[PDB]
Design a protein around this ligand. Structure first.
Ligand code: VV1
Ligand code: VV1
Ligand code: VV1
Ligand code: MN
Ligand code: MN
Ligand code: MN
Ligand code: MN
Ligand code: MN
Ligand code: MN
Lengths: 317, 317, 317
């Protein structure tokens, strides 16, 4: 079935942030047996491999923005691959890798499905522009490059000339926000972007959050869903092996709830599993805890249900 | 008071599963001071002691089902004792022991109160038949032996000739489900059993889960409540000394709220505190935590409330 | 603005309870950078230093009530300091110290604003009178001395002749309750005080709790809010370094939601951060975890929103 037909893409890239190890995200997600478990859940899994990311010598910074040609090139490569997966009538599954890869993952998806709606599950908005940013880490800027309403606010940054803004400010829902920069908060308010920060999650409950998110995107008519899951969206008690952990996250339950609900529409068209850094686990159990969580999230995106699952046969015979 | 007049039944039985230690459950629960805490809570506690489970050597498996004669006998002995306690006018308080014992606890209770409704708090449905089981562990099968609709789906199991299905599919509500086998999911959905898996708990909140659970069971008319409580229903962070732990469970708070709402109906007639395995705590602290949580749950069933409690006297005098 | 103008008062007092250390609370919270953090979120902060609590040797018990002259004098000195801060048009921020200091904090606040309402975040009611108390510890009795309806039930305790009940029973809302004494529960139900114990928070969700709390206190008319935050109101998994911890507490997110909702009214006028004891950490990390949770709740009271904040400037220029 279309909802369980998947194209796997390994994106072992870390240059959108300063912390080493996140490029090993595809390796540990694979080692934990992600592909085998998905196949055991009656999925049609095709593996497009791990993208080779060539080292860019003399990748000088654009103002304070670090590794601009490397980040741009890696997303350009990813955009090409995601579009090929989408042309094959499969759901693209990107195993990251830092969140700057969303530039390519979404751009690639929009090339085949321009009517796509984006759910962004993260502690962060990742919407700083190359000029509002204060760290110059591109993993905190991919939404700025993608938004149509920010065309003219993003300067010519090396490695990004291929990029065209493909999503309107009204086509994205944020779930999980708790660490947002002033410039990001300003953009969020001025562009009238829909979001459920942790305050909204506490207020309405994950049930009402998912009802409002799906009605906000699908209300008019069914349209393809791109879910960009940053594992720091969940609390560091579940996903500690991450680069930018923020206390008071979404529980293990809420995350499964979000992903089970998205599966049920049968409209998941693109997925990103981002920011798992296995070198950032204080103990070996902290890595395994994060990896296993990222696996459960992925499995729920393709049908694994807490109430149970069964083959369409008679088990009483 | 009726909802405070209790009769304790200790069931040191472990042969319904393969992990040693669960038989020590009634001892470690008594050693925590359970009886005393209940007395000090204005409860009429009468000790019916611990049941003597006579060892059955050469208990050859029935197909894949392990130690059937032992499990059949233990529950048979438990049914007589539970029925005796119920004839005395006391709430049966069964101390487990593995969940296979729910066979004898409910059948015994049903002999005195045939109209009873069951609230099953577990991570698991325990609804496999001696044929749909892959483990052959009878603690994962007690609901299949008790359901009327599955008469003809259960074969001649040695030790279970005394068993007569005492409840219909409509007379059971599940709360806390998160690890359901395909056979069990097929049973649950074809039998059309009411359930609240963790997905429904997240969607609704425990307030609505209980309002809906109790309305569905008690709406039509007042009826006896049998709460079968598997400590693995609660997340492993509150009850880690259990044989089959599953991540993302009911919190300590939801557990107390379930039992507080059941107390408040004044219709609790049977209680099972199952699967506390003191030999499975990863530290002596993990054992005491599971035991105190199990004690806390039990006290809430018989009136202990988080807002407080007082006697019918003027305290300002 | 009025909601970000603050007068910090240190109240290094411990004789309201037996465990040494709570007097270091103002020190450790200052050392965590509270003053600096508040100024980074556009606050006008004045520090009135730590109150000298000149020793009162010869302070024998009044019945079973411990250190009454010390508890009385500390609250008398605090009341005068809080009123002086209130007269200066600043939100009084009392860093405790044990919760017995609420007598003085609220009496002093009431002196300038007699129309104030109280929000009491705690695991306990702190409503024992000198006659209902079993422990004789005054941190468990502050509310009794303040309620108009309890006048006549308060005996003549040495060091408390300055006290006049300043709040009515209908002007206090409790949140977080889970350990209430029999005498306390009797007072709570007989006076008809609005309370949301952990049972209500479970039933309703913190969103309804806050909506009902702010409507119940401000629905008739807008008046100044006094928030008295006992850190033990949160689960000991976030605030373990405290004198009287109780499991099943308010989560980290719930504490931020309560304070976020209170800040948004723009009526917060007095705040108490009580019961932080840096000697009671089982590990140095449990101490830092407690102070940081206390600091986070505080910044939330003075505007720090999880969704983010921005200045009224064009960040895109
Ligand atoms: O733009 C920035 O560098 C920062 N702004 C807010 C977060 N604190 C680190 C930030 C990035 C997080 C990216 B993320 O982990 O969400 O992929
Ligand atoms: O039939 C089985 O062995 C298995 N089926 C699903 C559960 N995972 C282990 C199972 C049993 C749980 C029993 B219980 O701990 O709930 O008492
Ligand atoms: O009267 C008492 O001592 C006890 N009554 C219930 C609580 N258990 C300890 C008590 C006080 C809590 C004070 B508190 O930490 O809230 O300031
Ligand atoms: Mn991100
Ligand atoms: Mn993030
Ligand atoms: Mn069970
Ligand atoms: Mn179970
Ligand atoms: Mn207190
Ligand atoms: Mn307290």
């Amino acid at each position: 079935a279309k909802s369980r037909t998947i194209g796997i893409i390994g994106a072992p890239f870390s240059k959108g942030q300063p912390r080493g190890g996140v490029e090993e995200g595809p390796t540990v997600l694979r080692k934990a047996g992600l592909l085998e478990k998905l196949k055991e859940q009656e999925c049609d899994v095709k593996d497009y491999g791990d993208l080779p990311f060539a080292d860019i010598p003399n990748d000088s910074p654009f103002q304070i923005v670090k590794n601009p040609r490397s980040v741009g090139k890696a997303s350009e490569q990813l955009a090409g691959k995601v579009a090929e997966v989408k042309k094959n009538g499969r759901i693209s599954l990107v195993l990251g890798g830092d969140h700057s890869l969303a530039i390519g993952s979404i751009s690639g998806h929009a090339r085949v499905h321009p009517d796509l709606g984006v759910i962004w599950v993260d502690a962060h908005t990742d919407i700083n522009t190359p000029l509002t940013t204060t760290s110059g880490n591109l993993h905190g800027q991919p939404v700025s490059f993608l938004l149509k309403e920010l065309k003219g606010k993003i300067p010519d940054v090396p490695g990004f000339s291929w990029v065209t803004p493909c999503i309107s400010a009204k086509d994205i829902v944020y779930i999980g926000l708790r660490d947002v920069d002033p410039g990001e908060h300003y953009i969020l308010k001025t562009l009238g972007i829909k979001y459920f920060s942790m305050t909204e999650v506490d207020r309405l409950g994950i049930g009402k959050v998912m009802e409002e998110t799906l009605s906000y995107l699908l209300g008019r008519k069914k349209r393809p869903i791109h879910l960009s899951f940053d594992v720091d969206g969940l609390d560091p008690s579940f996903t500690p092996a991450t680069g930018t952990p923020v206390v008071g996250g979404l529980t293990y339950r809420e995350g499964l709830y979000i992903t089970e609900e998205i599966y049920k529409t049968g409209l998941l068209s693109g997925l990103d599993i981002m920011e798992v850094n296995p070198s950032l686990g204080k103990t070996p159990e902290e890595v395994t805890r994060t990896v296993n969580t990222a696996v459960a999230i992925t499995l729920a995106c393709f049908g694994l249900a807490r109430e149970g699952n069964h083959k369409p046969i008679d088990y009483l015979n």
